[PDB]
Amino acid sequence: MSLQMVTVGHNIALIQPGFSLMNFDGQVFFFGQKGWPKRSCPTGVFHFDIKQNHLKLKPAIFSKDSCYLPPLRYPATCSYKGKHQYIIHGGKTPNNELSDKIYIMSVACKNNKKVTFRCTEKDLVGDVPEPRYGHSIDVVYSRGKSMGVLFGGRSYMPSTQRTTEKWNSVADCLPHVFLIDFEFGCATSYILPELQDGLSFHVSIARNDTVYILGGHSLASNIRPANLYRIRVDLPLGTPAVNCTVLPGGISVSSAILTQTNNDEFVIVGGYQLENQKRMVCSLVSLGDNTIEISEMETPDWTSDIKHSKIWFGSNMGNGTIFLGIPGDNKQAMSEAFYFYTLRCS
Amino acid sequence: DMEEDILEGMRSQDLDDYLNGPFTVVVKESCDGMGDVSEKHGSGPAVPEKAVRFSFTVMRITIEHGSQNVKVFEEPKPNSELCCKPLCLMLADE
Ligand SMILES: [Ca+2]
């Protein structure tokens, strides 16, 4: 609950709504820049180093045998610590297309204060999910075997119901659950009768056998449902099995940012309460063996700029620190279009 | 909108005034910025506000009579201002 302003160097413009903040051994990295890969930094990723609250953005080159990736503006990113590597899937390219590749991101050499990523890609077979954004991906382990879950987000109309008077329209994806295998690219979709409507911009917490899909926004009904789920799964040697329960005590939350404060203890910082106005109070979630508890926290003090703004956005840096962003007011006509803050939980 | 001009075109090359197609229509395509458009009276420089349009131009129209192509329309002042029809307008930066 300690708000701190941060200042940005000369390449301030590469921050857009919908970035991605990777974490590698206490170090931070930026992803999802603006435009295309430039002449200066050919890859797109960056060093997000903050010292004395004046950040810089130094580039970071790739390996010899990587696969150069387009900057994805709203992907689903999960921390798969089984080495250490991030998983990117789907997204939204600069041409407003929706890619359908799984991007695996890991370090190959870090020395002389210069890193070298080794981004390779992976394709899915079986029940390939249609390309989308606003969704979330998570990995779970069971019986000594690993498996990745994937819940639906939102996407465009298919190639039949799409005419050019409404070419850029969107519709919520079908609310199945996908089980994806990072070893061989196998995906088998399962339809759940306890799951009714599509969901988008939710928060997903995993503890080793379950995914707590809390919040999320509904487009077809234009409401925010307060039904926190729990997808308790199981992985035998033969066929896998999924299960879900509906629990009480959820909150109407969408596009909030989730980060890790302690061991198995997480925090939720403001997304949107209704579509027009904002969400200010923050929530604390503590996990258990089989229980789930949410709880309010002490509402960290905001600047009057945050209390007067209409939107904001951001991600977490991993060390219990949220990096957010406020659009500067064009009525003052003297702004860099994006003021920033950092949020230390500790 | 250019009805009588295409009829006078095929009269001037001495075809029939009634003739089915197909005409081939060669159409120029162009999109470029428009700089500033701010109408800020005075006070202080409100903001930039750069806009940009998407436009086209019916450059020429040809037809064939069995064997040979013939040019029934040619637009005389190609990069003019009167003949650059607007198609899309947006108040977005280029
Ligand atoms: Ca020009």
Short mmCIF file of N, CA and C in Angstrom, two decimals, chain A residues 222-335:
data_model
loop_
_atom_site.label_atom_id
_atom_site.label_comp_id
_atom_site.label_asym_id
_atom_site.label_seq_id
_atom_site.Cartn_x
_atom_site.Cartn_y
_atom_site.Cartn_z
N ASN A 222 -23.53 -8.27 -20.94
CA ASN A 222 -23.01 -6.98 -20.49
C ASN A 222 -23.18 -6.77 -18.99
N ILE A 223 -22.78 -7.77 -18.21
CA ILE A 223 -22.73 -7.70 -16.76
C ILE A 223 -21.42 -8.31 -16.30
N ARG A 224 -21.14 -8.16 -15.01
CA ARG A 224 -19.95 -8.75 -14.41
C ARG A 224 -20.37 -9.73 -13.33
N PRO A 225 -20.27 -11.04 -13.57
CA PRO A 225 -20.83 -12.00 -12.62
C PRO A 225 -19.89 -12.22 -11.45
N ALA A 226 -20.48 -12.36 -10.27
CA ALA A 226 -19.75 -12.50 -9.01
C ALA A 226 -19.63 -13.95 -8.58
N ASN A 227 -19.35 -14.86 -9.52
CA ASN A 227 -19.31 -16.28 -9.24
C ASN A 227 -17.89 -16.80 -9.38
N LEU A 228 -17.18 -16.90 -8.26
CA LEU A 228 -15.86 -17.49 -8.30
C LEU A 228 -15.98 -19.00 -8.47
N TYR A 229 -15.20 -19.54 -9.40
CA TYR A 229 -15.24 -20.95 -9.70
C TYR A 229 -14.09 -21.64 -8.99
N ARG A 230 -13.97 -22.94 -9.23
CA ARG A 230 -12.85 -23.74 -8.77
C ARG A 230 -12.83 -24.98 -9.65
N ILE A 231 -11.80 -25.11 -10.47
CA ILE A 231 -11.71 -26.22 -11.41
C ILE A 231 -10.73 -27.22 -10.80
N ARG A 232 -11.24 -28.07 -9.93
CA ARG A 232 -10.45 -29.15 -9.37
C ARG A 232 -10.30 -30.23 -10.43
N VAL A 233 -9.07 -30.52 -10.83
CA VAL A 233 -8.84 -31.47 -11.91
C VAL A 233 -8.06 -32.66 -11.37
N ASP A 234 -7.83 -33.63 -12.24
CA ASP A 234 -7.14 -34.86 -11.90
C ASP A 234 -6.55 -35.45 -13.16
N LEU A 235 -5.34 -36.00 -13.05
CA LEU A 235 -4.64 -36.58 -14.20
C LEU A 235 -4.23 -38.01 -13.86
N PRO A 236 -4.99 -39.00 -14.32
CA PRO A 236 -4.55 -40.40 -14.17
C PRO A 236 -3.56 -40.80 -15.25
N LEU A 237 -3.21 -42.08 -15.28
CA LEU A 237 -2.37 -42.60 -16.35
C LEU A 237 -3.15 -42.74 -17.65
N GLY A 238 -4.45 -42.99 -17.57
CA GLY A 238 -5.24 -43.23 -18.76
C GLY A 238 -5.88 -41.98 -19.30
N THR A 239 -7.19 -41.84 -19.13
CA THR A 239 -7.77 -40.60 -19.63
C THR A 239 -7.85 -39.55 -18.53
N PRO A 240 -7.64 -38.28 -18.85
CA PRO A 240 -7.75 -37.24 -17.82
C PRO A 240 -9.21 -36.98 -17.47
N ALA A 241 -9.39 -36.29 -16.35
CA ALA A 241 -10.73 -36.00 -15.85
C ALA A 241 -10.74 -34.60 -15.26
N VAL A 242 -11.79 -33.85 -15.55
CA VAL A 242 -11.93 -32.48 -15.08
C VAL A 242 -13.18 -32.41 -14.21
N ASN A 243 -13.28 -31.35 -13.42
CA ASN A 243 -14.43 -31.11 -12.57
C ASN A 243 -14.43 -29.65 -12.18
N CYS A 244 -15.61 -29.10 -11.93
CA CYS A 244 -15.75 -27.72 -11.50
C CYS A 244 -16.87 -27.61 -10.48
N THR A 245 -16.73 -26.68 -9.54
CA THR A 245 -17.78 -26.37 -8.59
C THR A 245 -18.05 -24.88 -8.63
N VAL A 246 -19.26 -24.50 -8.26
CA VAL A 246 -19.65 -23.11 -8.15
C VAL A 246 -19.73 -22.76 -6.67
N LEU A 247 -19.10 -21.66 -6.28
CA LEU A 247 -18.94 -21.30 -4.88
C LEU A 247 -19.49 -19.89 -4.68
N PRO A 248 -19.87 -19.53 -3.46
CA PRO A 248 -20.34 -18.16 -3.21
C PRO A 248 -19.22 -17.25 -2.73
N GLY A 249 -19.47 -15.95 -2.88
CA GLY A 249 -18.55 -14.94 -2.41
C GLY A 249 -17.63 -14.33 -3.45
N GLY A 250 -17.98 -14.37 -4.73
CA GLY A 250 -17.18 -13.69 -5.73
C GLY A 250 -17.49 -12.21 -5.76
N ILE A 251 -16.69 -11.49 -6.55
CA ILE A 251 -16.82 -10.05 -6.71
C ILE A 251 -16.85 -9.72 -8.20
N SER A 252 -17.55 -8.64 -8.54
CA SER A 252 -17.68 -8.18 -9.92
C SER A 252 -16.39 -7.47 -10.31
N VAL A 253 -15.49 -8.23 -10.92
CA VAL A 253 -14.15 -7.75 -11.23
C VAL A 253 -13.74 -8.25 -12.60
N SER A 254 -13.19 -7.34 -13.40
CA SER A 254 -12.68 -7.68 -14.71
C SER A 254 -11.50 -6.78 -15.02
N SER A 255 -10.52 -7.36 -15.72
CA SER A 255 -9.23 -6.73 -16.04
C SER A 255 -8.52 -6.19 -14.80
N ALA A 256 -8.54 -6.96 -13.73
CA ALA A 256 -7.69 -6.65 -12.60
C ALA A 256 -6.40 -7.45 -12.69
N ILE A 257 -5.39 -7.01 -11.96
CA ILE A 257 -4.06 -7.60 -12.06
C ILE A 257 -3.75 -8.36 -10.78
N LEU A 258 -3.30 -9.60 -10.95
CA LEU A 258 -3.04 -10.54 -9.87
C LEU A 258 -1.55 -10.69 -9.66
N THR A 259 -1.10 -10.63 -8.40
CA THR A 259 0.31 -10.82 -8.12
C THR A 259 0.46 -11.55 -6.79
N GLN A 260 1.68 -12.00 -6.53
CA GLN A 260 1.99 -12.89 -5.42
C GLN A 260 2.69 -12.11 -4.31
N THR A 261 2.06 -12.04 -3.14
CA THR A 261 2.66 -11.34 -2.02
C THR A 261 3.53 -12.27 -1.18
N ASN A 262 2.94 -13.34 -0.65
CA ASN A 262 3.70 -14.30 0.15
C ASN A 262 3.69 -15.65 -0.55
N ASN A 263 4.20 -16.67 0.12
CA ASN A 263 3.90 -18.03 -0.29
C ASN A 263 2.40 -18.28 -0.16
N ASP A 264 1.81 -18.84 -1.22
CA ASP A 264 0.39 -19.06 -1.49
C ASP A 264 -0.55 -17.97 -0.98
N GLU A 265 -0.20 -16.71 -1.24
CA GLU A 265 -1.04 -15.59 -0.83
C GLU A 265 -0.95 -14.51 -1.91
N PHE A 266 -2.09 -14.07 -2.42
CA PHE A 266 -2.17 -13.21 -3.59
C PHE A 266 -3.04 -11.99 -3.31
N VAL A 267 -2.96 -10.99 -4.19
CA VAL A 267 -3.66 -9.73 -4.00
C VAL A 267 -4.25 -9.29 -5.34
N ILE A 268 -5.37 -8.56 -5.27
CA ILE A 268 -6.10 -8.11 -6.45
C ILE A 268 -6.20 -6.59 -6.41
N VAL A 269 -5.67 -5.93 -7.43
CA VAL A 269 -5.67 -4.49 -7.48
C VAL A 269 -6.57 -4.06 -8.64
N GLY A 270 -7.21 -2.89 -8.50
CA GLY A 270 -8.39 -2.46 -9.23
C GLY A 270 -8.51 -2.61 -10.73
N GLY A 271 -9.55 -3.33 -11.15
CA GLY A 271 -9.94 -3.41 -12.54
C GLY A 271 -11.09 -2.47 -12.83
N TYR A 272 -12.29 -3.00 -13.04
CA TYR A 272 -13.45 -2.15 -13.31
C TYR A 272 -14.65 -2.72 -12.58
N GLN A 273 -15.37 -1.84 -11.88
CA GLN A 273 -16.53 -2.26 -11.10
C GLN A 273 -17.78 -2.29 -11.96
N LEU A 274 -18.06 -1.20 -12.66
CA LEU A 274 -19.03 -1.17 -13.74
C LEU A 274 -18.32 -0.70 -15.01
N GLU A 275 -19.06 -0.69 -16.12
CA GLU A 275 -18.45 -0.33 -17.39
C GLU A 275 -18.08 1.14 -17.47
N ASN A 276 -18.88 2.02 -16.87
CA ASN A 276 -18.69 3.46 -16.96
C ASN A 276 -17.70 3.99 -15.94
N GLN A 277 -17.89 3.68 -14.66
CA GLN A 277 -16.98 4.11 -13.62
C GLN A 277 -15.97 3.00 -13.32
N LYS A 278 -15.22 3.18 -12.25
CA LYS A 278 -13.99 2.43 -12.03
C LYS A 278 -14.06 1.58 -10.77
N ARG A 279 -12.96 0.90 -10.46
CA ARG A 279 -12.85 0.15 -9.22
C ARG A 279 -11.65 0.63 -8.41
N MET A 280 -11.89 1.05 -7.17
CA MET A 280 -10.84 1.62 -6.34
C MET A 280 -10.36 0.71 -5.22
N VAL A 281 -11.26 -0.01 -4.56
CA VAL A 281 -10.87 -0.83 -3.42
C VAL A 281 -10.15 -2.07 -3.92
N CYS A 282 -9.20 -2.57 -3.13
CA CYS A 282 -8.40 -3.72 -3.51
C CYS A 282 -8.70 -4.89 -2.60
N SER A 283 -8.42 -6.09 -3.10
CA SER A 283 -8.86 -7.33 -2.47
C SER A 283 -7.66 -8.23 -2.19
N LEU A 284 -7.74 -8.95 -1.08
CA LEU A 284 -6.71 -9.89 -0.66
C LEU A 284 -7.28 -11.30 -0.65
N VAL A 285 -6.59 -12.21 -1.33
CA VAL A 285 -7.00 -13.61 -1.40
C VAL A 285 -5.92 -14.48 -0.78
N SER A 286 -6.31 -15.31 0.17
CA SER A 286 -5.41 -16.25 0.82
C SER A 286 -5.89 -17.66 0.52
N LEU A 287 -4.99 -18.50 0.04
CA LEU A 287 -5.35 -19.86 -0.33
C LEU A 287 -5.19 -20.79 0.86
N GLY A 288 -5.62 -22.03 0.67
CA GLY A 288 -5.48 -23.05 1.68
C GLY A 288 -5.24 -24.41 1.05
N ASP A 289 -5.47 -25.47 1.81
CA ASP A 289 -5.37 -26.82 1.26
C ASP A 289 -6.57 -27.08 0.36
N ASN A 290 -7.76 -26.78 0.86
CA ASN A 290 -8.99 -26.95 0.10
C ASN A 290 -9.89 -25.74 0.15
N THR A 291 -9.53 -24.70 0.89
CA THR A 291 -10.40 -23.55 1.06
C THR A 291 -9.96 -22.40 0.15
N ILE A 292 -10.82 -21.40 0.07
CA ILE A 292 -10.55 -20.15 -0.62
C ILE A 292 -11.19 -19.01 0.15
N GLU A 293 -10.40 -18.01 0.49
CA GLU A 293 -10.89 -16.85 1.22
C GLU A 293 -10.49 -15.59 0.49
N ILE A 294 -11.46 -14.72 0.23
CA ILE A 294 -11.14 -13.38 -0.24
C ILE A 294 -11.40 -12.43 0.91
N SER A 295 -10.84 -11.23 0.80
CA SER A 295 -10.84 -10.28 1.89
C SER A 295 -10.44 -8.92 1.34
N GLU A 296 -11.00 -7.88 1.92
CA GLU A 296 -10.60 -6.53 1.59
C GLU A 296 -9.24 -6.23 2.20
N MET A 297 -8.58 -5.21 1.65
CA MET A 297 -7.40 -4.63 2.26
C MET A 297 -7.65 -3.14 2.49
N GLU A 298 -6.59 -2.42 2.81
CA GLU A 298 -6.73 -1.12 3.46
C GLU A 298 -6.76 0.06 2.49
N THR A 299 -7.12 -0.17 1.21
CA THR A 299 -7.39 0.84 0.18
C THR A 299 -6.25 1.85 0.04
N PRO A 300 -5.16 1.49 -0.65
CA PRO A 300 -3.98 2.37 -0.72
C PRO A 300 -4.30 3.73 -1.33
N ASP A 301 -3.65 4.76 -0.80
CA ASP A 301 -4.00 6.13 -1.14
C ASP A 301 -3.63 6.45 -2.58
N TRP A 302 -4.57 7.05 -3.29
CA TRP A 302 -4.37 7.40 -4.68
C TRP A 302 -4.11 8.90 -4.82
N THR A 303 -3.40 9.25 -5.88
CA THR A 303 -3.26 10.64 -6.27
C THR A 303 -4.59 11.11 -6.85
N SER A 304 -4.80 12.43 -6.84
CA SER A 304 -6.01 13.01 -7.40
C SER A 304 -6.10 12.82 -8.91
N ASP A 305 -4.97 12.56 -9.57
CA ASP A 305 -4.99 12.22 -10.99
C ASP A 305 -5.63 10.87 -11.22
N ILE A 306 -5.33 9.89 -10.36
CA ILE A 306 -5.94 8.57 -10.47
C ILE A 306 -7.42 8.65 -10.12
N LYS A 307 -7.76 9.45 -9.11
CA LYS A 307 -9.15 9.57 -8.69
C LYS A 307 -9.99 10.37 -9.68
N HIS A 308 -9.36 11.06 -10.63
CA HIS A 308 -10.10 11.79 -11.65
C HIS A 308 -10.02 11.16 -13.02
N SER A 309 -9.13 10.19 -13.24
CA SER A 309 -8.98 9.59 -14.55
C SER A 309 -10.13 8.64 -14.84
N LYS A 310 -10.23 8.21 -16.07
CA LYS A 310 -11.33 7.34 -16.46
C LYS A 310 -10.88 5.90 -16.64
N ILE A 311 -9.69 5.68 -17.19
CA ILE A 311 -9.14 4.34 -17.37
C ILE A 311 -7.77 4.27 -16.71
N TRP A 312 -7.30 3.04 -16.51
CA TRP A 312 -5.90 2.75 -16.24
C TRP A 312 -5.65 1.29 -16.56
N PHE A 313 -4.38 0.91 -16.58
CA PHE A 313 -3.96 -0.40 -17.04
C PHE A 313 -2.59 -0.69 -16.44
N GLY A 314 -2.20 -1.95 -16.45
CA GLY A 314 -0.87 -2.31 -16.01
C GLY A 314 -0.75 -3.80 -15.78
N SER A 315 0.42 -4.20 -15.30
CA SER A 315 0.74 -5.59 -15.03
C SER A 315 1.57 -5.64 -13.75
N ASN A 316 2.00 -6.84 -13.36
CA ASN A 316 2.87 -6.97 -12.20
C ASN A 316 4.29 -7.28 -12.64
N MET A 317 5.25 -6.88 -11.80
CA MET A 317 6.65 -7.14 -12.07
C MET A 317 7.13 -8.41 -11.39
N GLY A 318 6.33 -8.98 -10.50
CA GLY A 318 6.67 -10.25 -9.88
C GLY A 318 7.13 -10.23 -8.45
N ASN A 319 7.84 -9.18 -8.04
CA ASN A 319 8.34 -9.13 -6.67
C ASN A 319 7.35 -8.44 -5.74
N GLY A 320 6.08 -8.82 -5.85
CA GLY A 320 5.01 -8.14 -5.14
C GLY A 320 4.85 -6.68 -5.53
N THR A 321 5.23 -6.33 -6.75
CA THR A 321 5.17 -4.95 -7.20
C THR A 321 4.36 -4.86 -8.49
N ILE A 322 3.29 -4.07 -8.45
CA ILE A 322 2.44 -3.81 -9.60
C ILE A 322 2.95 -2.55 -10.28
N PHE A 323 3.10 -2.60 -11.60
CA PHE A 323 3.37 -1.42 -12.41
C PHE A 323 2.09 -1.06 -13.15
N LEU A 324 1.59 0.15 -12.94
CA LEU A 324 0.36 0.57 -13.60
C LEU A 324 0.62 1.74 -14.53
N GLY A 325 -0.45 2.31 -15.07
CA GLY A 325 -0.33 3.43 -16.00
C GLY A 325 -1.58 4.26 -16.20
N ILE A 326 -1.44 5.57 -16.20
CA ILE A 326 -2.55 6.51 -16.30
C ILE A 326 -2.38 7.32 -17.57
N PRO A 327 -3.42 7.50 -18.38
CA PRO A 327 -3.31 8.41 -19.52
C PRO A 327 -3.40 9.87 -19.10
N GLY A 328 -2.45 10.66 -19.59
CA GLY A 328 -2.40 12.06 -19.20
C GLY A 328 -3.48 12.87 -19.89
N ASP A 329 -3.95 13.91 -19.20
CA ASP A 329 -5.07 14.71 -19.68
C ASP A 329 -4.64 15.63 -20.81
N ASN A 330 -5.30 15.49 -21.97
CA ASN A 330 -5.04 16.37 -23.10
C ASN A 330 -5.68 17.74 -22.95
N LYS A 331 -6.51 17.93 -21.92
CA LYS A 331 -7.06 19.26 -21.66
C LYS A 331 -5.99 20.22 -21.15
N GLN A 332 -5.01 19.71 -20.41
CA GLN A 332 -3.89 20.54 -19.98
C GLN A 332 -2.98 20.90 -21.15
N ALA A 333 -2.98 20.06 -22.20
CA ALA A 333 -2.25 20.22 -23.46
C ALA A 333 -0.73 20.23 -23.27
N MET A 334 -0.25 19.76 -22.13
CA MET A 334 1.17 19.63 -21.82
C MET A 334 1.34 18.31 -21.09
N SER A 335 1.58 17.24 -21.85
CA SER A 335 1.63 15.90 -21.27
C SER A 335 2.42 14.99 -22.20
#
